[PDB]
């Protein structure tokens, strides 16, 4: 609970290099034990406009700093994250509820984004192009966009911020972060470390706010004329609202929107491996992630063997309970509204045909815990309105042919992550290429990596994060026609 | 006027490989002589939804065609454009009014975009990335987005279409083009040539429509769920409306919006060269282009010498008249509303301080011709609401220092093209990098090139066209985590 | 005025066995001297629905406890 | 800006100060004219507009202009 470096746990907003409290505050509680964690500043439009101005002024100086220098600071920040990983992990478990081991995994991943972009900062290359005319030379420069509004969800309170801010700073931009109200701490802990690292004032700003101010602040920073870029990860409903705000001033935008991830198991698949993969892809963070496989398309031949081995793995490895306690594997659901959505989905499915294979009611610890559920005999039509219902729930839909599985998977106008298991070399390419998704896992249920491009197609998002393409979301191309030769 | 290959001059819409007339039609007239050119189909929402379906179905097959094959067709189309360049140029002069020599210049440029992307089609490379884990390999594929709605202005009735469609097809996408109502012919001439080249039915579609249906059709194709990308070039007002339409379904967007282009002349500049550059950058297409230098920031020292030599060049080289007639250098303004805006700007400026140096009234040929105007003693505040007023008008604003010129130039929240003349090596870099614009001309007034990236920053646009980055606007990245190793 | 067992004088709401503060607070004053007594949590509908759920879950166990 | 773009001539510092935030450079514009003070009767800052005049009667007339008087 406590024992943390008092400096890491923060309650005030971080603007212009200083800790500023707000006129109001909002409470933050441990989603597992219900304990009060702290009173965080509840920023309003005024505090947001001020955070933007702070970022804009820092930008005019930060853009001038050498890439080798910005790179150095991004690295010191990374080292500070590693130095404090244990405390940083406890903060994640405290507010998100995910098990410590998973929180430690996030803190590393989060730190790795800072490390990675640190390395990208010195590698922004312009080009020299050849043109017919002998009286001129064509040069293409790449420059930072300016101030970026970064809005993150609660699922990965640290890594989701770090993968956007890393890129932004590496490119030479400054940012104003508006963290999720369920998990604001991880965003402020970063801020503390950013001042320890020596990040110049106004380069990294955090403005926590609750549901009340979310609407106002969200539109304030996605509308402000000093903001030139918006990076958002969350629901499609909010994403479209921000896309309209952006439209009014033609702001550059990149976002990831919660979608359904298909997990196809083909006959030629290694059962145990598929199961192991299904275990990780569905119960990591208790099924609360956009890249969490919601629907399982399993082929007739191997279906039964799979559904049985899957359930046997759930009983053997999932231990519901408090994330800080040794042996916990499933943490609580972020809140009541969440539990209600899982219940909704489970009941809607059973009363419509589905057959619950294991645990389909709230867990006996009460509060926000729910039993890891596995229903088979599920059908496509039972996923409506639950495309954004995350929880430790696994509906298994049987299928006959490959064409069928692909057709079902590509159903939605969604497309973020997609997984499938097979041992057929040829089939692996056909599916991997035909799956209309932004990321595909082949014989693997965990595909996270800071050096690969994360994002989605169609309505699942715009742009990519991480990898060598991440920094591109924050640069502007300038064609310079050097003539008079 | 006539004598054209009857097949090149078309009046019906081109959808699904067939010429389909619409329930209504709209008249097209030669902006110089007022002559009736033809009755063009006026497509409505129904014809648009049908053109989209046609493109979507063609896409599912076109995406499968080898890149070497798509590349071949893009080239045959290019060869067909060159083979018919003379007639294709006459059509541009007929509807846009620009002089034949300029029309010939456009047809080449337009043909060069098809040639260029033809070459890009076979060069879409995915990557192989290294990750820590030894049990997996990371592959990144690039695939076409799908159907793209392409909306073009009247300024370059051919090149503006070709630079977007070239990229789209090269990437493997299909398109539905909605050409400007003032100049629909050039878009249909292309269509004829696309069927001669062998472009599969539904890959290239054109749906002409007038002001009435513009609103409806525009929203129809930027809203349709079968459309995944929007490419627009035109006014900021329309651009923002399309950006809202796009927002509702998270569509990928790229656009260029009419902005003010500063043309700075520094003391160390070669007068004649600056003048020659000022002549080309302001009177090409009679000043009717988004990249047409509207305001001239000239330094005290060289000011007078410049303003005088500029005017002397205007009298010596600008010959107002009909674009088809030998010796014409200035064509008509697209329409009456246009002439009124030029008048507005000229009067607003003179009555507010400005001093007309030459021709500041309508031309003596009447109709839509306006005299090439050059006002000096102009001041910043006299450009308000005229940021989208194009015409053969050149306001000269004197300045003292470089810091001042840059400050004035970066004024607007606009940023498309920018020009400046200087002979100071160091100054050339400072200005070229500080000018918040998407394209900068150094000692050159004409920067067009199909191998360089065209576009703008801030509110002037999103994405780039032409160059090696053009095809990127039409691709989607797919991270494939090949594991189980 | 003071000298009280600090544990007896409380300012947070008491839900689910824990002391939880609220987003807002309201002042309490001695009706005779007008002195400030403390800032108490000002619960809203959210805190109330949560207190109810807490009570409902405790009920399913409390009803089972022997009367003795 | 309203003053310079309307005739005024900035004699010294007329932009935000280089410390940013709320600092502004002490400004002194000459060639200023009466009509350039509208809606700024309550605009306070380190700004000094100089208006030239010929006669005393003129100065008094200009000064007593507004229905103000502190």
Main-chain dihedrals φ then ψ at residue A246, nearest 5 degrees: -60, -45
Question: What is the nearest CA distance from D57 to chain B, expressed in angstroms?
Answer: 30
Which of A451, A424, A212, A416 lies closest to A299, judged by CA?
A: A424
Residues of chain A with Cβ-Cβ distance to C16 below 8 Å are 34
Instruction: Pick A25's closest partner by Cβ from C23, C49, C57.
Output: C23
Strands B18-20 and B13-15 turn out to be antiparallel
Based on the fold, state whether residues B135 and B41 are members of the same structural domain: yes
Main-chain dihedrals φ then ψ at residue B171, nearest 5 degrees: -75, -20
- Could you tell me if B420 and B266 are in contact, meaning their C-beta atoms sit under 8 angstroms apart? yes
Question: What is the nearest CA distance from A217 to chain C, expressed in angstroms?
Answer: 18
Exposure class string for B243-269: b at 16+ Cβ within 10 A, else e:
bebbbebbbbbbbbbbbbbbbbbbeeb
Which residues in D have their CB inside 8 Å of a CB on B? 5-6
Tell me whether residues A452 and B236 touch, CB distance under 8 A: no
Identify the bridge partners of residue A465 per DSSP, sorted by sequence position.
A454
Strands B174-178 and B147-151 turn out to be parallel
Question: What is the nearest CA distance from A354 to chain B, expressed in angstroms?
Answer: 31
The span from the CA of B442 to the CA of B398, in Å, is 19
What is the signed CA dihedral for B73, B75, B78, B80, rounded to 10 degrees?
Answer: -60
Q: Which residue of B has its CA nearest to D6?
A: B381
The span from the CA of C39 to the CA of C25, in Å, is 6
Which residues in B have their CB inside 8 Å of a CB on D? 379-381
The burial class, CB within 10 Å (0-12 / 13-18 / 19+), for C37 is middle
Main-chain dihedrals φ then ψ at residue D5, nearest 5 degrees: -70, -5
Residues of chain B with Cβ-Cβ distance to D6 below 8 Å are 381
Q: Which residue of A has its CA nearest to C46?
A: A336
Name subunits touching D (3+ CB pairs < 8 A): B
Tell me whether residues B469 and A462 touch, CB distance under 8 A: no
DSSP string, A358-377: E--SB-TT-TT-B--EEEES
Residues of chain D with Cβ-Cβ distance to B381 below 8 Å are 5-6
Based on the fold, state whether residues B206 and B347 are members of the same structural domain: no
Tell me whether residues A367 and C57 touch, CB distance under 8 A: yes
The span from the CA of B29 to the CA of B334, in Å, is 10
Contacts A–C by Cβ distance under 8 A: 29
Tell me whether residues C19 and A36 touch, CB distance under 8 A: yes
Based on the fold, state whether residues B325 and B206 are members of the same structural domain: no
Tokens of B80: 């067909």
Instruction: Pick B459's closest partner by Cβ from A236, A249, A459.
Output: A249
Instruction: Pick B250's closest partner by Cβ from A433, A437, A459.
Output: A459
CATH number for A274: 3.40.309.10
Q: What is the resolution of this structure in A?
A: 2.4
Beta strands in B335-472 (DSSP E): 355-358, 373-376, 393-399, 417-421, 439-442, 461-462
Based on the fold, state whether residues A210 and A324 are members of the same structural domain: no
Q: For testing the chain B interface, which of D1, D2, D3, D5 should be mutated: the one with the most B CBs within 10 Å? A: D5
Tokens of D56: 């005393």
Question: What is the nearest CA distance from C32 to chain A, expressed in angstroms?
Answer: 30
Question: What is the nearest CA distance from B272 to chain A, expressed in angstroms?
Answer: 12
Tell me whether residues A36 and C16 touch, CB distance under 8 A: no
Residues of chain C with Cβ-Cβ distance to A361 below 8 Å are none
The span from the CA of B67 to the CA of B33, in Å, is 45
Tell me whether residues A244 and B244 touch, CB distance under 8 A: yes
Based on the fold, state whether residues A479 and A375 are members of the same structural domain: no
CATH number for A249: 3.40.605.10
Residues of chain D with Cβ-Cβ distance to B380 below 8 Å are 5
Residues of chain A with Cβ-Cβ distance to C18 below 8 Å are 33-36
The span from the CA of A346 to the CA of A377, in Å, is 12
Domain that holds residue B280: 259-449
Instruction: Pick B433's closest partner by Cβ from A141, A273, A443.
Output: A141
Based on the fold, state whether residues B43 and B134 are members of the same structural domain: yes
The domain total for chain A is: 2
Tokens of B116: 């260029």
Residues of chain B with Cβ-Cβ distance to A444 below 8 Å are 135-136, 481, 483-484
Question: What is the nearest CA distance from B34 to chain A, expressed in angstroms?
Answer: 37
The span from the CA of A269 to the CA of A422, in Å, is 4
| DSSP-derived secondary structure letter, B239 | H
**Helices A100-120 and A67-83, interaxial angle, to 10°?**
170
- Could you tell me if A142 and A99 are in contact, meaning their C-beta atoms sit under 8 angstroms apart? no
Contacts A–B by Cβ distance under 8 A: 182
Q: Which residue of C has its CA nearest to A212?
A: C23
The burial class, CB within 10 Å (0-12 / 13-18 / 19+), for B413 is middle
Instruction: Pick B455's closest partner by Cβ from A225, A421, A477.
Output: A477
Q: Which residue of B has its CA nearest to D3?
A: B381
Beta strands in A342-474 (DSSP E): 355-358, 373-376, 393-399, 417-421, 439-442, 461-462
Tokens of D26: 């002490």
Which of A147, A146, A221, A227 lies closest to A179, judged by CA?
A: A221
The span from the CA of B260 to the CA of B262, in Å, is 6
Instruction: Pick C23's closest partner by Cβ from A210, A336, A366.
Output: A210
3-state secondary structure of B106: helix
Question: What is the nearest CA distance from D30 to chain B, expressed in angstroms?
Answer: 18
| DSSP-derived secondary structure letter, A286 | T
Exposure class string for A404-430: b at 16+ Cβ within 10 A, else e:
ebbebbbebebbbbbbbbbeeeeebee
The span from the CA of B36 to the CA of A445, in Å, is 65
Q: In the structure, do chain C and chain B come into contact, i.e. share 3 or more CB pairs under 8 Å?
A: no
Based on the fold, state whether residues A361 and A240 are members of the same structural domain: no
Q: For testing the chain A interface, which of B242, B247, B438 should be mutated: the one with the most A CBs within 10 Å? A: B247
Measured CA to CA in angstroms, residue A400 lies from A397, A404, A406, A409, B194 at distances of 10, 7, 11, 13, 42
Q: In the structure, do chain A and chain C come into contact, i.e. share 3 or more CB pairs under 8 Å?
A: yes
- Could you tell me if A295 and A265 are in contact, meaning their C-beta atoms sit under 8 angstroms apart? no
Residues 6+ apart with CB under 8 A from B118: B71, B72, B74, B75, B78, B166, B170
Based on the fold, state whether residues A379 and A428 are members of the same structural domain: yes
Which residues in A have their CB inside 8 Å of a CB on C? 24-27, 29, 33-36, 39, 42, 210, 336, 366-367
Residues of chain B with Cβ-Cβ distance to D5 below 8 Å are 379-381
Question: What is the nearest CA distance from B35 to chain A, expressed in angstroms?
Answer: 38
Q: For testing the chain A interface, which of B124, B414, B479, B482 should be mutated: the one with the most A CBs within 10 Å? A: B479
Question: What is the nearest CA distance from D5 to chain B, expressed in angstroms?
Answer: 6
Which of B227, B56, B59, B54 lies closest to B151, judged by CA?
A: B227
The span from the CA of A393 to the CA of A342, in Å, is 7
Which of B261, B369, B392 lies closest to B314, judged by CA?
A: B392
Main-chain dihedrals φ then ψ at residue B200, nearest 5 degrees: -55, 145
Based on the fold, state whether residues A17 and A55 are members of the same structural domain: yes
Tokens of B171: 């990437």
Tell me whether residues C24 and A26 touch, CB distance under 8 A: no
Based on the fold, state whether residues B105 and B204 are members of the same structural domain: yes
- Could you tell me if B463 and B229 are in contact, meaning their C-beta atoms sit under 8 angstroms apart? no
Instruction: Dihedral sign for Cα A58, A60, A65, A69, please.
Output: positive
Instruction: Pick B452's closest partner by Cβ from A138, A250, A441.
Output: A138
Q: Which residue of D has its CA nearest to B382?
A: D5
Which residues of D are annotated as part of the binding site for NAD(+)?
Answer: 42-44
Based on the fold, state whether residues B152 and B233 are members of the same structural domain: yes
Based on the fold, state whether residues B197 and B128 are members of the same structural domain: yes
Instruction: Pick B484's closest partner by Cβ from A443, A457, A482.
Output: A443
Instruction: Pick B247's closest partner by Cβ from A247, A270, A476.
Output: A247
Question: What is the nearest CA distance from B2 to chain A, expressed in angstroms?
Answer: 34
Residue with the two structure tokens 């990144």: B140
């Amino acid at each position: 609970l406590a024992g943390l470096s008092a400096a890491l746990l923060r309650t005030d907003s971080f603007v212009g290099g200083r800790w500023l409290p707000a006129a109001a505050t909002f409470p933050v509680q441990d989603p597992a034990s219900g304990a009060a964690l702290g009173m965080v500043a509840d920023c309003g439009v005024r505090e947001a406009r001020a955070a933007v101005r702070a970022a804009y002024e820092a930008f005019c100086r930060w853009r001038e700093v050498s890439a080798k220098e910005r790179s150095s600071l991004l690295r010191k920040w990374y080292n500070l994250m590693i130095q404090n990983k244990d405390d940083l992990a406890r903060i994640i478990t405290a507010e998100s509820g995910k098990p410590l081991k998973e929180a430690h995994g996030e803190i590393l991943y989060s730190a790795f984004f800072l490390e990675w972009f640190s390395e990208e900062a010195r590698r922004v290359y312009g080009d020299i192009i050849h043109t017919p005319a002998k009286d001129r030379r064509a040069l293409v420069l790449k420059q930072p966009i300016g101030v970026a509004a970064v809005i993150t969800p609660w699922n990965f309170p640290s890594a989701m911020i770090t993968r956007k801010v890393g890129a932004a700073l590496a490119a030479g931009c400054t940012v104003v972060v508006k963290p999720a109200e369920d998990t604001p701490f991880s965003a402020l802990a970063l801020a503390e470390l950013a001042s320890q690292a020596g990040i110049p004032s106004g380069v990294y700003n955090v403005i926590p706010c609750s549901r009340k101010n979310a609407k106002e602040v969200g539109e304030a920073i996605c509308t402000d004329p000093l903001v030139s870029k918006i990076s958002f990860t969350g629901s499609t409903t909010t994403g479209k609202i921000l896309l309209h705000h952006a439209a009014n001033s033609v702001k550059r935008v990149s976002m990831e929107l919660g979608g359904l991830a298909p997990f196809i198991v083909f006959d030629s698949a290694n059962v145990d491996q598929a199961v192991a993969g299904a275990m990780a892809s569905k119960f990591r963070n208790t099924g609360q992630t956009a890249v969490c496989s919601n629907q399982f398309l399993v082929q007739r031949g191997i279906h039964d063997a799979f559904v049985k081995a899957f359930a046997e793995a759930m009983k053997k490895n999932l231990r519901v309970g408090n994330g800080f306690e040794e042996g916990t594997t499933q943490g609580p659901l972020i809140n009541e509204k969440a539990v209600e959505k899982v219940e909704k989905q489970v009941n809607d499915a059973v009363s419509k045909g589905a057959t619950v294979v294991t645990g389909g009611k709230r867990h006996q610890l009460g509060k926000n815990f729910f039993e890891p559920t596995l229903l088979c005999n599920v059908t496509q039509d039972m996923l409506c309105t639950h495309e954004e219902t995350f929880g430790p729930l696994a509906p298994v839909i049987k299928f006959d042919t490959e064409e069928e599985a692909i057709a079902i998977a590509n159903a939605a106008d969604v497309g973020l992550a997609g997984y499938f298991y097979s041992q057929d070399p040829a089939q692996i390419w056909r599916v991997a290429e035909q799956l209309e998704v932004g990321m595909v896992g082949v014989n693997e249920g965990l595909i996270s990596s800071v050096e690969c491009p994360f994002g989605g197609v169609k309505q699942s998002g715009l742009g990519r994060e991480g990898s060598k393409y991440g920094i591109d979301e924050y640069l502007e191309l300038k064609y310079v026609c050097y003539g008079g030769l």
